[PDB]
Structure 1
């Protein structure tokens, strides 16, 4: 019995496992329950706190993945399978993981809490890319990650109902946050220095915690990677959540809300997942059936309204995007695209793809997108059209929403730092045309290139080490720069005047100005004016 691996938390005693990191050991406590299992009558309901337990709970292994859809577009392919569940699926999935230095930190250490992405329909904290050991060992950080409910289980809502109120996956995350405030000191973590970080739907999640008052006493800083609470996909209205929940119910033979929710609770988990992708209003990509709802509770108003009227004075945010945010999504619905060819498309296929990639756009608004993204010197060139399609989807769904948030936060007191991530992993199994796809910065921030068995280059290991420092410097101080340092390319704050951000690549930091400024003016200022007049 190694006393470093034995911790007492409020609910009882835990035994962790000593893991090997490249430069030394780390203590890991995996599969710690933070809620009562949300099963049977507790499906669709807010999480309840975990009852205390007897003896010593075994926290040496990852727990089950929340019940979710599993991707089958390309069986066996690493590019898709690296995001699929790696533990058994279950509705009993509300557990969290903690990595700490070995021996445990002498003095209180900054805490980073990772919230995974996956469209609010998928994801798990057990995926290898989310491995906290490298950050623990190298940076001395305490790293925490939680499972939260996804799909119908986390986000099906009959708004105003007592028994399916909506947003329960966000309340799962909040309970884990509450757990960290109460327990993280036992691991050497500093509960007065918690940084949320996440990617895609996890970044949207982080933003929702910034915009929900109860969450704000549970952290101090935030990192939003490739995702925002504002934007086209991260929220639905109460009417539209009700519509989808009602249509899903109908699809599974169910059945007054009480009666409808009750019948849904009798259905096997897979029966719900079976009909998950039949409730969307259009043929679309980058669109997810069950997501956070503007309920007037967790979210007091729309994220747009909230970001425009918020006071962000004692907040620090790190935000950014990858170079090719849209590319990944094109192979999942747009005719002409595939990982297995160069996806050189016709102009006809481009016009069609815009209707799928901007599914809420009217005929005129779709036409304005096509005209803006056409290179009128090469209007029919298949490479330009393919790359333009990627751009439309990435800009609409991620870059322009990020730019808009960055600017509101900055304008309203927040200290903001922005980046574009431009390095394509040498190990990537997706084709060259997709570039630096959505999700492929995470492995560098988590420090996976430091594991020499993973076949990254020496430059990537050095690069990962740089990114780990920025993120953990930010966690420590709300500033990604070194306090004592190498020095003379400093990462400057993003402001609404200068609009400075940095390129994250194998070369030293480069400061640029304007995150797609002209194009995001199109999406953020023109298109809203268009369809609100028309």
Structure 2
């Protein structure tokens, strides 16, 4: 010390860190990457809740991203940006409990609102190091303190033998909670305000944000929340204690593990990480799409009851939520799983293929429930039309898994005291490599919220750069005040809060804000009110 940049030297509870000065289009940013927040969850610690990281001696280098949590790498379309952009960009390791911090350069003089990003990837994949989650633009342009963490995914994060000591479940959510705890204690050293923390996430990340809202020990660690294309409630974000027990026992059999839970978990702990990844998908109860094997469990601990019971009975008076969806939530889920669908053709399907797809898309549906889905989504004027059937299939999956669980959450939070702001993202990136029939697929709003169009080397249009700047302003104004609206800008269209009376939401596209009413109201009344009665 003494020859290095004094603006990049910081101390945390665990010790000294050395960060890196990064270039963002408009100027420098301070980045502290790969900070350890927990004891490596390896060996005897596999399946166990995280332990806080013991202090270190000397200056820890925090200039590079750390290991990505052990997961299944997508090799479906080799060289394809559409799939490769989501793949791990660092080495896979069980030693992965690290977090990243981006702050303005020089570090802010007064306490600054903090944004904590929780990534998606069906609770089996993801990393905080991906290029779409780059906090440098938000830190530079908006002056934000951005934090992102790695949490255990798959069997490593969510394999549960409910009631056991050794594998209690939801440990990946506890990794997230420990990083929220770390922010409270240490973010002030970076110029961050621990008294103004906003959680934001997408897909499984949004479901994770939702589970922090529904779990009392997490509520003291944040003030506001953003749930993008994901919710704690719904058909995929959780499993029962019985279902998690079933899936962990089946995986144990599959890898040669046999009679109490201690014996079974000890044997699972001797298995190489890849053996577990190789059998992960083989525990699903049916042929399905938008279903993940190891997800949060309703344990009676982290989740005191189902997220459905919790959202219907909870008091959310003190809460501000920003929720929303993309135009085509379900389109991507059809390419691996539904026969007749491909990214390399227009995917014009037959009626038989549509009926077959509804059984895959709604796997828990009875013959009668699936018929109600088919009859609702058929256009009885053109019941055999291949383009309509193709789109209806996308809508079934999108509506069942995302839009209607989002509408249900917005409705319940608003009715029970929260301040809700709802959106629909309708802009398809000019740079998208997925076919046009897929529209705006699941996760393709992220690059805009994070401000990637501001980098001139990424070849986005001028319109897309102005639009990204607009979105970065909505998100950070929401983090700052609990309202996405700019107080100085009187002229710009206001984003009204979502209410049960008016059911107002906005469209996020290249045009100025548009206020719309009812988030897929007739269709979501079918999924949220009728279909549960067709489970009797």
| Distance in structure 1 (CA, Å) of the matches to 2:79 and 2:246 | 36
Deviation string, structure 1 residues 199-225 (Cα, Å, up to 9, x no partner): 000000000000000000000000000
Deviation string, structure 1 residues 328-362 (Cα, Å, up to 9, x no partner): 10001000000000000000000000000000000
Moved more, 523-532 or 340-349: 523-532
Deviation string, structure 1 residues 476-514 (Cα, Å, up to 9, x no partner): 000000011153410000001100000000000000000
Q: CA deviation at 1:4?
A: 1.0
Residue 243 of structure 1 aligns to a residue whose secondary structure is helix
| Distance in structure 2 (CA, Å) of the matches to 1:125 and 1:378 | 45
Q: Mind listing any 5+ residue stretches in structure 1 that lack a counterpart?
A: none
Deviation string, structure 1 residues 268-292 (Cα, Å, up to 9, x no partner): 0000000000000000000000000
| Distance in structure 2 (CA, Å) of the matches to 1:487 and 1:392 | 39
| Distance in structure 1 (CA, Å) of the matches to 2:378 and 2:76 | 30
| Distance in structure 2 (CA, Å) of the matches to 1:277 and 1:27 | 40
Alignment size in residue pairs: 532
Deviation >6 Å, runs of 4+: none
Residue 107 of structure 1 aligns to a residue whose secondary structure is coil
Deviation string, structure 1 residues 406-458 (Cα, Å, up to 9, x no partner): 00000000000000000000000000000000000000000000000000000
TM-score (norm 2): 0.99
Residue 174 of structure 1 aligns to a residue whose secondary structure is helix
Please say if 1:206 is aligned against 2:209: yes
Residue 319 of structure 1 aligns to a residue whose secondary structure is strand
CA RMSD of aligned residues (A): 0.5
| Distance in structure 2 (CA, Å) of the matches to 1:460 and 1:210 | 32
Q: CA deviation at 1:109?
A: 0.3
Please say if 1:51 is aligned against 2:54: yes
Please say if 1:420 is aligned against 2:420: no
| 1:129 alignment counterpart | 132
| Distance in structure 2 (CA, Å) of the matches to 1:96 and 1:143 | 11
| 2:343 alignment counterpart | 339
| Distance in structure 2 (CA, Å) of the matches to 1:196 and 1:332 | 31
Q: CA deviation at 1:531?
A: 1.6
Deviation string, structure 1 residues 173-196 (Cα, Å, up to 9, x no partner): 000000000000000000000000
Residue 254 of structure 1 aligns to a residue whose secondary structure is coil
Residue 236 of structure 1 aligns to a residue whose secondary structure is coil
Q: CA deviation at 1:3?
A: 1.1
Residue 144 of structure 1 aligns to a residue whose secondary structure is strand
| Distance in structure 2 (CA, Å) of the matches to 1:334 and 1:223 | 31
| Distance in structure 2 (CA, Å) of the matches to 1:330 and 1:367 | 19
Moved more, 441-450 or 68-77: 68-77
| Distance in structure 2 (CA, Å) of the matches to 1:382 and 1:123 | 34
Q: CA deviation at 1:75?
A: 1.1
| Distance in structure 2 (CA, Å) of the matches to 1:86 and 1:103 | 28
| 2:529 alignment counterpart | 525
Q: CA deviation at 1:242?
A: 0.2
| Distance in structure 1 (CA, Å) of the matches to 2:239 and 2:131 | 31
Deviation string, structure 1 residues 382-429 (Cα, Å, up to 9, x no partner): 000000000000000000000000000000000000000000000000
Q: CA deviation at 1:530?
A: 1.5
1:2 paired residue among 2, 5, 30: 5
Deviation string, structure 1 residues 18-66 (Cα, Å, up to 9, x no partner): 0000000000000000000000000000000000000000000000000
| Distance in structure 1 (CA, Å) of the matches to 2:118 and 2:38 | 16
| Distance in structure 1 (CA, Å) of the matches to 2:314 and 2:535 | 26
| Distance in structure 1 (CA, Å) of the matches to 2:391 and 2:309 | 33
| 1:24 alignment counterpart | 27
Residue 397 of structure 2 aligns to a residue whose secondary structure is helix
Q: Mind listing any 5+ residue stretches in structure 2 that lack a counterpart?
A: none
Structure 2 counterparts to residues 336-485 of structure 1, below 5 A? 336-485=340-489
| Distance in structure 2 (CA, Å) of the matches to 1:447 and 1:68 | 27
Deviation string, structure 1 residues 303-339 (Cα, Å, up to 9, x no partner): 0000011000010000000000000100010000000
Residue 439 of structure 1 aligns to a residue whose secondary structure is coil
| Distance in structure 1 (CA, Å) of the matches to 2:173 and 2:506 | 31
Structure 2 counterparts to residues 31-430 of structure 1, below 5 A? 31-255=34-258, 256-430=260-434
| 1:510 alignment counterpart | 514
| Distance in structure 2 (CA, Å) of the matches to 1:32 and 1:332 | 36
| Distance in structure 2 (CA, Å) of the matches to 1:38 and 1:530 | 43
Residue 418 of structure 1 aligns to a residue whose secondary structure is strand
TM-score (norm 1): 0.99
Residue 421 of structure 2 aligns to a residue whose secondary structure is strand
| Distance in structure 1 (CA, Å) of the matches to 2:437 and 2:323 | 25
